[PDB]
Amino acid sequence: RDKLNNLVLFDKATYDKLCKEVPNYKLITPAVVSERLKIRGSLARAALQELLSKGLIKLVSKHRAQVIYTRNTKG
Amino acid sequence: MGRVRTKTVKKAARVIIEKYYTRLGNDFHTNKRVCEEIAIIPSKKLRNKIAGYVTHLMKRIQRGPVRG
């Protein structure tokens, strides 16, 4: 329990992970993806709205403090 | 709790019951007006305390021999 040393900028080794199964679970949030990919969290928010623009991620809340995403409609 | 009456209010209640029995009944609202003209009660919060006990003793006086 010393530091997080999260990556402020995407590397390709995790960018492909972003593009494969990051939009695959219901509780995709900036915080959850931040600790899952070891990314900063500001980068998590900025890139999450990029997948929002690509339209493969559905939003419900859009709150200044608690924004909630989810995967597409499956089934 | 904490609503026990005083010797002041009770004594006046005994006084007026056995002096003005025919002019009193079992209504708090009627009797509080009855006490206005025979008794000079300096407090609005005291005149309804006397009459509240007066109806109390009148409920009992229709059943038992009160000391008054």
Partner: protein, 189 residues
Amino acid sequence: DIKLFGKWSTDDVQINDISLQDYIAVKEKYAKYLPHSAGRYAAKRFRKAQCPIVERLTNSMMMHGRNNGKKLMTVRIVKHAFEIIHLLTGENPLQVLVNAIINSGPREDSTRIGRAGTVRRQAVDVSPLRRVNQAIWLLCTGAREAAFRNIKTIAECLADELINAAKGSSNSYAIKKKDELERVAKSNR
């Protein structure tokens, strides 16, 4: 019919055991559109029971100086959490909460004043009112403990706390303290 936060009606929720039935207020009469009411519930002993449990969690969720009158921040945190738990599990958020309350309340405790055994001496079981109150307090504290110095937020912390509590996995703070309180109470029988 009531559609708390526009959805999640209280007609399809239940309590699995009759001990908590009288004091859980997800009833249709005790159903509210919004968990906020300055209804003077705490004017008398046992008069807080009919207050809706969602509102009870709302009141309980503000602590630690920075959060003492702030109810608007609390309601927005709880509402966002409810949508989160409904998303992550697929059932009624109130049904998940009620399962958590049942599973988190400790069935026993212990208290003595003299030379105690380990912490207390005599084991004394609790009332259903203490079952509810300890449950809500445990859940709220578990959320605050998790998000103190990290990137997770409170609506997430309350979400995972209810998820782990409503099932039982020895990872929720609430059931972790329930294990300790019951183990020590058995040791102090």
